[model samples]
Target: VSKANVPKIDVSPLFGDDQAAKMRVAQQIDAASRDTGFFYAVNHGINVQRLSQKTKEFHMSITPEEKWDLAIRAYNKEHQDQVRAGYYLSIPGKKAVESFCYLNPNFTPDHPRIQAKTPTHEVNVWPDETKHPGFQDFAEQYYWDVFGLSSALLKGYALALGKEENFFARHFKPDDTLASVVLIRYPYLDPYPEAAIKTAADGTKLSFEWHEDVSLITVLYQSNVQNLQVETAAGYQDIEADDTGYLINCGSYMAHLTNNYYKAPINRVKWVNAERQSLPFFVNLGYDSVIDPFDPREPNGKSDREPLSYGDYLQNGLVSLINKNGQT
Candidate 1:
């Protein structure tokens, strides 16, 4: 569907040599963050075109054959989001879609969560060369690309909030293996799950349950299919994203950083005639890093909530996702 065409903002100012440019951009972002907290961003240096192409290239991993072989181990809630990362999926009762990979920073027993080996530091699971020969190539290779863009965007957020470009720098170390890079496919339900279809019409079902995100920043890109909506006092607003731009929004952490000045709106997705594909990069701070605004700047960026670990901000909350049951 290449469903793009959305309100756009340029982030190039955050990377330039002018303080005014940075402040102007920050003012723009702060307004959006405070009101809608939704915007389509461009000029942030992400290879959106390549990322889009690679998305189609990675679609083969969703085949029934590969689904059975590589998707099962990932669905294990027991080792979920921990060291044993793989493709875990859910049926339509609560959500819709199949995730190819949900990779986190690769840490071991020695990582944070301190004395107790926490589940948050686990690595991701990937379908190696055995089945989808180049699956690993695409997933791992693209991981950095997505990671790079997200990293830069986070910094842009700091500047957008009227802080130094590197204000939130240390929290996101290059080696701090933390974050969720996920590729999901929400196919049109051919034989819908009874729950998602119970009292609904032919083309309606929640792709994701309504909830605000847990991470600090969320960077997302979606295929042509629409149904993504954000809660507004007026009602849910449909978000149509541009193929070359990403839809970005602040989350709980961002709101926390701004002492509630910025809002993280609740968002959800519904499916229609065609399936929708989305790539979301959930960026997090280091496991042990304190959740303070860390950006020593942003005079008004005080904390409304008690500062906690990046992990504490999530309160060890595991993301519960239910998506397409692979029928259509």
Candidate 2:
């Protein structure tokens, strides 16, 4: 897609006047919700310098040897036993690379877990922190920035729901909510085939399979390389990167909130030049926040969908991911 036609939304004015900005954001949210359910947000303040530095530091800290070591540990049953004894059992497999969750300090004891899978906040098995001194700070800052962005998006969603901008915010404590940032890296293809296909060197196309996320929304920051594609009415279209902003998309929770009127488009990473990396921050409501299937505003109105509990939806999603990657 050309840059001109690329979906872009300006959020700078939102900082100047809260009320007017919220109204405008709400309007944009309404339009984007039904159409793309994905858009680029520009001028939402995130510390670009810190993000860059942390990205560099993380890359530098984890060398090829370390990566291989981790991968082997994930694959070897004995090593997996050791890792799981210290960490959680369902982790330490190919799934760790394909899917893993992280959390900020805010996650509490009441969070849901299917089959005894622990919350990301409780179990962060880090690489040697002695080698990376500021890793904790970087992680904390990244979490806060992502949370801020997610809050702004949630406000827009509330507006799209025909409610006051802060309608959803009152439902839970910000600290009680959980967020996870995931990293995916895809290597270059040798042939660069004309036709689109999903496969790596080993012929396993499951870099990530077709599935929707359980979070309220997900914000993805892609590298310069373009490999991430989203299913659209037109076809599978590449997710073009936004240099100065982030690519925000709806997840199953948001789609459910809209009664599935808004789509959570299926997406996958195709092979590309160099190693393409993406950072997706999945944000969710607090553990106890209930998802009312029938809009409370229109309780007696004509919507046939039944209310789904948040716990059920999230558990299903987690189970699907774990199963796909052959994780216990």
Error of 2 at 57 (Å): 2.0
Model 1 C-alpha RMSD to native? 5.0
Error of 2 at 46 (Å): 0.4
Q: Candidate 2 on 53-169: residue-level lDDT in tens?
A: 675566545654444334423444544422221212222222223322356544434544322454332433455677667866677678777777777777777766776666565
Give candidate 1's TM-score: 0.80
Clashes of 1: 19
Candidate 2 regions exceeding 4 Å error are: 1-6, 13-17, 63-101, 107-121, 187-206, 295-302, 324-328
lDDT of 1 by residue, 1-328 (tens): 1232245778776556777776776777766776667887788687666666666666744555555455533454354333224554656554445665555434544554423655455545555466555656766666676667666666667776666666566577655646767777666666665554322222335545466777788888876665677777766667774667788888777766666666777776654546667888777777777756433244553444677678655544443322222221
Give lDDT per model, in order. Answer: 0.62, 0.58
Identify the leading candidate in terms of lDDT.
Answer: 1
Please identify model 1 stretches exceeding 4 Å from their true place: 1-6, 61-65, 68-84, 90-96, 104-116, 197-205, 293-304, 319-328
